[PDB]
Design a binder for this molecule. Structure first.
Ligand SMILES: Nc1ncnc2c1ncn2[C@@H]1O[C@H](COP(=O)(O)OP(=O)(O)O)[C@@H](O)[C@H]1O
Ligand SMILES: [Mg+2]
Length: 213
């Protein structure tokens, strides 16, 4: 039968919305750091599953090997970052990815308008939004041991949606799908991806694998 999914729309916190507009509509050099930020978030999620384990082993589910996979798709013009980390519940998506204020957001915008490099974004507590330096749309599929699978999505414009994902089960973890802008297709190339992982993510404590078509 036909599947049905409930969709909820949310407004980004005021300053997060301002930061996204700034990011999308201003030229910045060194945009490649978006990958470092996404890999760091996967690394953090993998640390969480590691610390959640041994303590409470009787609640372990999905995935198996703790790792990060990078999957560029030239045909679809997408770059996907997949991890087997802890994942996020529906409440986590809503709270952590848009609705709650970050104390460093205003400071970061002030810094950028005065010439700071976008690379500092991670240190101001808003690293995820660096995804919009290269993506026109971002989809996040996630599955946490304590909830069902959900899909978060935003093309900016001040709001994002969250819905139950009835599509292919992904197992415990998170998948960030970047729909790359027309002028940012260099990030689909094997050599370029290897270059930036070596330059900015050469110390992550988990296996990172690049799948090349
Ligand atoms: N791969 C992921 N797995 C689980 N949670 C994630 C993932 N990526 C982002 N998140 C959530 O989004 C929040 C915001 O990330 P970010 O903007 O990079 O800030 P920070 O890493 O400083 O918390 C993270 O704290 C985490 O709760
Ligand atoms: Mg981060």
């Amino acid at each position: 039968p036909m599947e049905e999914e409930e969709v909820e729309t949310f407004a980004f916190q005021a300053e997060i919305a301002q930061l996204m507009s700034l990011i999308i509509n201003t030229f910045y050099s060194n945009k490649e750091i978006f990958l470092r930020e996404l890999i760091s978030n996967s690394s953090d999620a993998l640390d969480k599953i590691r610390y959640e384990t041994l303590t409470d082993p009787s609640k372990l589910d999905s995935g198996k090997e703790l790792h990060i996979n990078l999957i560029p798709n030239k045909q679809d013009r997408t770059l996907t970052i997949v991890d087997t980390g802890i994942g996020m519940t529906k409440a986590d998506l809503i709270n952590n990815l848009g609705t709650i204020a970050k104390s460093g957001t205003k400071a970061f915008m002030e810094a950028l308008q005065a010439g700071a490099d976008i690379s500092m974004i991670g240190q101001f507590g808003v690293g995820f939004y660096s995804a919009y330096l290269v993506a026109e749309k971002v989809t996040v599929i996630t599955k946490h041991n304590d909830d069902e699978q959900y899909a978060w999505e935003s093309s900016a414009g001040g709001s994002f949606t969250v819905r139950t994902d009835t599509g292919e089960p992904m197992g415990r973890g998170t998948k960030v799908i970047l729909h790359l802008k027309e002028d940012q297709t260099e990030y689909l190339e094997e050599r370029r991806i290897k270059e930036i992982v070596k330059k900015h993510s050469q110390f992550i404590g988990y296996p990172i694998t690049l799948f090349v078509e």
